[PDB]
Structure formats: C-alpha cells, structure tokens
Ligand binder design. Sequence first.
Ligand SMILES: Cc1cc2nc3c(=O)[nH]c(=O)nc-3n(C[C@H](O)[C@H](O)[C@H](O)COP(=O)(O)O)c2cc1C
Ligand SMILES: Nc1ncnc2c1ncn2[C@@H]1O[C@H](COP(=O)(O)CP(=O)(O)OP(=O)(O)O)[C@@H](O)[C@H]1O
Ligand SMILES: [Mg+2]
Length: 296
Amino acid sequence: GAMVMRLGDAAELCYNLTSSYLQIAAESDSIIAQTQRAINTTKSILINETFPKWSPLNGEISFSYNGGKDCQVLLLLYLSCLWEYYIVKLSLTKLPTVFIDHDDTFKTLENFIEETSLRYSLSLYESDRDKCETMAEAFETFLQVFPETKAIVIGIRHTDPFGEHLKPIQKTDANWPDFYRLQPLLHWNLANIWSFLLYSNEPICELYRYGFTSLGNVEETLPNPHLRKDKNSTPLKLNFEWEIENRYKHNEVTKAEPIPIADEDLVKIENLHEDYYPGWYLVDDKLERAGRIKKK
Ligand SMILES: Cc1cc2nc3c(=O)[nH]c(=O)nc-3n(C[C@H](O)[C@H](O)[C@H](O)COP(=O)(O)O)c2cc1C
Ligand SMILES: Nc1ncnc2c1ncn2[C@@H]1O[C@H](COP(=O)(O)CP(=O)(O)OP(=O)(O)O)[C@@H](O)[C@H]1O
Ligand SMILES: [Mg+2]
C-alpha cells in the first residue's frame, strides 16, 4: 500500500495466515500436520499460560528479536495470539522488542531487522554494537532502561545448543539479570519452521535464499555444505513446493516486496565459487549448524 501497516493490521494478518495454515487439509504423517500441531501447542502456551500472567500490552513482556527465521516464525505466531486473545476471545501502537546488536552481525540481517521493524510495528531497543559486553550484560542494561520488564520472549528450540532442558516458562539463571524466559517455540523442528514461514508469504532474511540455514556471525558462518550443488551427488528434493505455490495471498494493505541481500554479503557469496540450494532444502535439525568455519 501507500502506507505501512498499523500494528492492528499486522496482528490481524498474522491471525488470518495462521488460521489459514491451520485449515490446510493435511495427512497425519505430513510435515504440515506436524506444523499444525506445533502451532496449537505454541498458541496454548501464549494464550493459556503466558498472557493471563504477564501483560503483553504494558511493557511487562518484551520480544527478543534478531531477524532470524525462528524469532520471525515466533513473532508471527505471537502477533496472531495477541489478536486472538484480545479481539477474538475478548479477554498499543508498537510491540516492545529488544535486539542485542554486535559488531560481527551480517549486514543483510541488520537491513532485515530494520525492514521488519517497520513492517511489524516493532518498538525496537537496540544495544550498542560497538560495546564489548556479554548478552547477560546487554540485558542488564536493557532492564535498567525498562525496569517494568518481567518476561522476555525467545525463539529458542530444543534442537538448539543448550536447548535440551529448557522449559516454555522459566526464570533466567543466577548469572543473568532476573526475568522469566518465555520460550514458546521449543517443540518446533526445522521442517516446521520452513513449512510455516514459506506459506506465510512474509519476506524472510535473504541469506536463507543463498544456502544459509543458520545465522551466526559474519566470520564463522557459511552456506550449509550439505546444500552445495554438484553434478555427481543425488540432487535434493524440495519439501515445500505446495506451501510456496499456495502461500497466503496479500491485498493492498498487507502487500510486501522482496529485497536482495546486502551488497557486501553477495560479494562473499560469489567469492565462494560454489552454488547452494536455499536453506529450506535442509530439513535435518542435526545439520542446521553445519555451515561454520573450522576452528581449534
Ligand atoms: C532474552 C534471553 C535470555 C537468556 N537467558 C539465558 C539464561 O538465563 N541462561 C543461559 O545459560 N542462557 C540464556 N540465554 C542464551 C544465551 O544468551 C546464549 O546461550 C549465550 O550464552 C550468550 O553468549 P555470551 O554470554 O557470550 O554473550 C538467553 C538468551 C536470550 C535471548
Ligand atoms: N542478538 C540477539 N538479540 C535479540 N534476541 C536474540 C539475539 N540472539 C538470539 N536472540 C534470541 O534467541 C533466539 C535464537 O537466536 P539466533 O539463533 O541468533 C536467530 P534465529 O531466529 O534462531 O534464526 P537462526 O537459527 O537461523 O540463526 C532468537 O529467536 C531470539 O529470540
Ligand atoms: Mg534458531
């Protein structure tokens, strides 16, 4: 449209695309069916266990966001649940959001966080990228600025490093500033993330198109070697042709347009002299972090 969506437009959009996904007739042994189950579990955590305890309206909840596929899927679900909770169940101009910036963050990701903060009406606190501090330390500063904060939404999954023992709702550790971690994406597998994200028709970080499946820092992170194209390997098959073809249609209000990667990231991807399937050709969680510079 001629104007960016208001938060109410964004939340309603997320509710409608999520309801739509949930309406797909899928076989019980399918990725989509599993993803529908994952959504319903997420919803229940937000609507039944989170929102009755902490207000998503008054700053008590902040949303941790760094433009990655997982926090992005979680954001869409969170926005969906806000609309469901207040409009549909009858139980704010911007969403309180926190991003801890670093000096080695991908430029494409920086641009994506900028672009989506506008699209999703995020009220984004951004830590100083040029300060040398731990995440804990950045979050302690954040909490001094917003001492109303009781809880923070995080898009961590069980398959992530240190994810095994995590719970949907739990306090931070002794060495962190004191708040509840709200972790409603824990049960999501990689195939579910891709399925829902491609069906959503939301713009996603362009690094994924170029074979990245995990976004660490600019030095350490490579396109996934399991996605490298070659003439003598069995070619990879796409699990998400339907979701792409049938992705959630937009109108004038909800219309989005595509962005190429940052120029400097394209350069590093050309320098490689290898080509890759996009990230959504990887559905094996064990291999999600395969694309990393060898160390030690
Ligand atoms: C909002 C939020 C809260 C977190 N709380 C904890 C925590 O209490 N304990 C923990 O081990 N990791 C926690 N993490 C994950 C860590 O930040 C990550 O695993 C890593 O330890 C941070 O690296 P750094 O300490 O070198 O900056 C949290 C992450 C986020 C985004
Ligand atoms: N620098 C940062 N600022 C704010 N939140 C962050 C953060 N780093 C991590 N998080 C939180 O921790 C969860 C996992 O972090 P990341 O792996 O860095 C991005 P992602 O969304 O998981 O996609 P990725 O797995 O493709 O990198 C995120 O969903 C986000 O909620
Ligand atoms: Mg992740």
